[PDB]
Write an enzyme that holds these catalytic residues in place. Sequence first.
Site, short mmCIF file in Angstrom:
data_model
loop_
_atom_site.label_atom_id
_atom_site.label_comp_id
_atom_site.label_asym_id
_atom_site.label_seq_id
_atom_site.Cartn_x
_atom_site.Cartn_y
_atom_site.Cartn_z
N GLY B 16 -13.64 28.61 4.97
CA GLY B 16 -13.95 28.48 3.55
C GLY B 16 -14.01 29.81 2.84
O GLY B 16 -13.06 30.21 2.17
N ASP B 17 -15.13 30.50 3.01
CA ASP B 17 -15.33 31.79 2.36
C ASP B 17 -14.94 32.99 3.20
O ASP B 17 -15.31 34.12 2.88
CB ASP B 17 -16.80 31.92 1.97
CG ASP B 17 -17.16 31.02 0.82
OD1 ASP B 17 -16.25 30.76 0.02
OD2 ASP B 17 -18.33 30.59 0.71
#
Lengths: 161, 163
Positions: B16-17
């Site tokens: 995700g990040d």
Amino acid sequence: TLQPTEAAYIAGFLDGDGSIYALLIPRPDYKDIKYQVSLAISFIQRKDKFPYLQDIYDQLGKRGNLRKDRGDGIADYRIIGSTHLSIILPDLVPYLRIKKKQANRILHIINLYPQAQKNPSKFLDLVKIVDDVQNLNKRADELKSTNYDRLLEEFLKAGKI
Amino acid sequence: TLQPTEAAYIAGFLDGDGSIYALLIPRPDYKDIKYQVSLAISFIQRKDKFPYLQDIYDQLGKRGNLRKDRGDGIADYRIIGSTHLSIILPDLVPYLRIKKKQANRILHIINLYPQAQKNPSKFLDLVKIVDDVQNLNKRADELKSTNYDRLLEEFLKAGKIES
DNA sequence: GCAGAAGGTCGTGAGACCGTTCCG
DNA sequence: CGGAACGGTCTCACGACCTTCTGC
Ligand SMILES: [Ca+2]
Ligand SMILES: [Ca+2]
Ligand code: NA
């Protein structure tokens, strides 16, 4: 069918590219309480990565709505409603880190909803949770949600409370 | 001491990040080949959420470097180098999805690095992979990385390679 | 001489809703 | 109805490097 590391991976991805939020929808067609509380979790990703969202969709029992493209080249997977969320959130909660609180608030709303549906005072306590969830998704220096203040005012103006 | 669901969570958060990448760092003070293959995986998050990165840091044996603020209100946790990544990546690969390939390509570069060091021709093969990892981090419509092409031309004009 | 730590930043890919239409 | 599915979009929070300072 959701294995531990699957739920864990999803919570991680959700804490990353996802969102857990609640909002108040105006409903003119409704009666005494012209509002509907919407609860949801979503995953967002550039459209070429759509399959990955699809995979999460299957692991979550195919609950929710997938969009190959929202209209801006971005794809998403949104799971709206207590029906889906009451089953899914319990599985992700133990692994959620960044958005763990938001998840527990949705769950609380889901708990209170049945009795808040047509009770102005109760509905308000439920709307205050919506504000908290929305505020948890903001930076500290942003204007806080004020659905409770606005609805209390409306409810009084309408002699409902 | 990394538990499965801890590794799975990290892999998902990284997908995700996070970011898994490789690049070439020009090194003016190097000998034969004046470049260094820098390898890394990183996690990024807004400043106010720095403690969550700290947690992952502790979970990954405190390997890498944390920054409360990169300078733009964003905090990050970067794990650089073969030593650290040869230990951490094998733990996350089982659960990585989106960046799995990038991870396996870094691992491949780590396998080849030792012998590619003072060998121009092999160092290029290695740089081809650096472009691949970089291309894996692009949209299909974007201009592909040119580390291999430019390095070959430099090696040729430097007499380091004959063909 | 080699490389990890620390600094800096452009171009988005996300997030977190708000809106409108469909349906059993 | 009372959701359920479909639309749409502003405002950043990221990602994925590139650049420079340290350490032995
Ligand atoms: Ca994020
Ligand atoms: Ca992402
Ligand atoms: Na992200």
